[PDB]
Amino acid sequence: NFDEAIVCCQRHLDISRELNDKVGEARALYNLGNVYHAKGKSEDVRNALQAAVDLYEENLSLVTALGDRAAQGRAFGNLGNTHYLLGNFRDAVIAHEQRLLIAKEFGDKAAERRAYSNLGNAYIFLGEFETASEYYKKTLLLARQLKDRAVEAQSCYSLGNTYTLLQDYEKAIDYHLKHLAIAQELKDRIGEGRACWSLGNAYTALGNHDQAMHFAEKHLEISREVGDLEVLFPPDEDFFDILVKCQGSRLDDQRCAPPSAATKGPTVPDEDFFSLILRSQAKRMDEQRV
Amino acid sequence: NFDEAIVCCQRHLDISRELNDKVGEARALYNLGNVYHAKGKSFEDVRNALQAAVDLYEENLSLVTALGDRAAQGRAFGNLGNTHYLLGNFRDAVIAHEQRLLIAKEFGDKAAERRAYSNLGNAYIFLGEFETASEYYKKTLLLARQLKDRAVEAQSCYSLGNTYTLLQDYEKAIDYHLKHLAIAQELKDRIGEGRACWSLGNAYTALGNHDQAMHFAEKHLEISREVGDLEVPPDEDFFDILVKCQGSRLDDQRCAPPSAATKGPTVPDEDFFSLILRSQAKRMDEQRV
16 A cells, blocks of 8 residues: 555645645654555665665654654664665664653653664674673663563563574573473463474584484474464564575475465564574684685 | 565475375465455566456466365455455456355354455445445444454444435434444554544534534544654555645644554544545535536
8 A cells, every 4th residue: 555655745744845844844754654664564665664764763853853853762672673684684673772861751661662772783784793682681680670481582582692692502592491491481482492403403513413303303293383364463584484484305395385374483583694693603614614 | 675585486386286185286376366455565577467456366366276175266256356446447346245244144253254244345435335335334333342342443434424424314313433432442442533533523524513623633633743743554645634625724644754654453444534534525526506
């Protein structure tokens, strides 16, 4: 519906400019940035996304002239997310950083946490894993204070992936187990299949074939059943149960559900860096080769 | 991630063909059809992704049929219905979902039965066959109650609401949307509430009840206002914009960022507000002389 929508906001903005309506112009700019933003995630896509950024940044300066701190916040947060989708992790960070500060001013714990969590993701893409674990830990402490079991599990998972990248599999396992617990606790099956792969992949890197073998099987069982699924209660498009079983010619256990049933559990983080991890130890295997 | 994924399934399929592995070939075909399917709704060369998925699912189907797995045939049929639906082949959609319903009936699968009735209703709505569509929505409504599913229940009511509105029976339309508005409030689905309110206030308008119309429009307006300021099921129908696109009274357009752009549990898969909008738009111009 992205085209009917865009014309409408254009109409709205058109009018607001004619009427010298500073508020409504800013709103139309936000609305129009939101549509583009959503078009951008559904490489002339870069055109939709750069528009959204342009639009949000215009709105920002305006809502700043007005002086609405919450409304500046909404733009900053959107800017973080758009830049993030574009690769401008540099700019992502700058924008989310403000967003965290504005959540701090309002004492917004949920928005504080989301921002730490967002910042973490950006730092991971920058390869700055040390500075990223710093934020994930922050987001973890907040989740507990927020009494949010779900997010809690996500920060654990996210910290898991982090340390795995640092090649500290001892702390990685610690975190994923904490997450595997909340998964079971909250009965998030899809999240369970995720931990199990992760764990079984960490242990592998430790030489614990015994424990690795175990988890791979737990993952295999859950994998098997979510393939036969046709519906599920968050659009998981990372093709996890296929990518993760793409090694050599032992491929019989690739699984993938239809888009309807392709949802991520409440304990899976926004970003799961399995493929990075995968590609990253792939690089090192070849580096040892001589 | 759609490209790494496709080559993997391709590898898998390649191998399964080499090994004369009939099961694994069918599985690779399903996996490959699922990736395309998902590419099709996220990346009009899209028609290429979607027609592939169909081709892929149809191959798999004949194969799983050779094997004789009724549940696995079922998964393909259901996918086929959904892919055709996305393509416009509402004809083909129906044929495929029909089987799916029958297969859910064989297994006594009430949840799958219901989803299929509901899917069939959507297809018939796009065919302009609104009479035959209310027939299915009513089926899906009875099942929801039997399933004890308050959420779906509200969705069938909402869906029936839109249906009758198209039939220009605003009296029954209102009845259904009110039933839905109740469950919405009951289950505290705010976003769903703003939907009912618009719908109702739009129906009443068509009845001449300015009094009640004016009411709901205000309830909708209040919810609308607050979900725009929000920051955290991908609702991409731009409802709170499209619905306020009449004349130059546009100050109340609202739209949330993608993160916060989720649909409530009582909003149906398909909300036909735009059809309704465009449909009474056609008639306004038709009366003009």
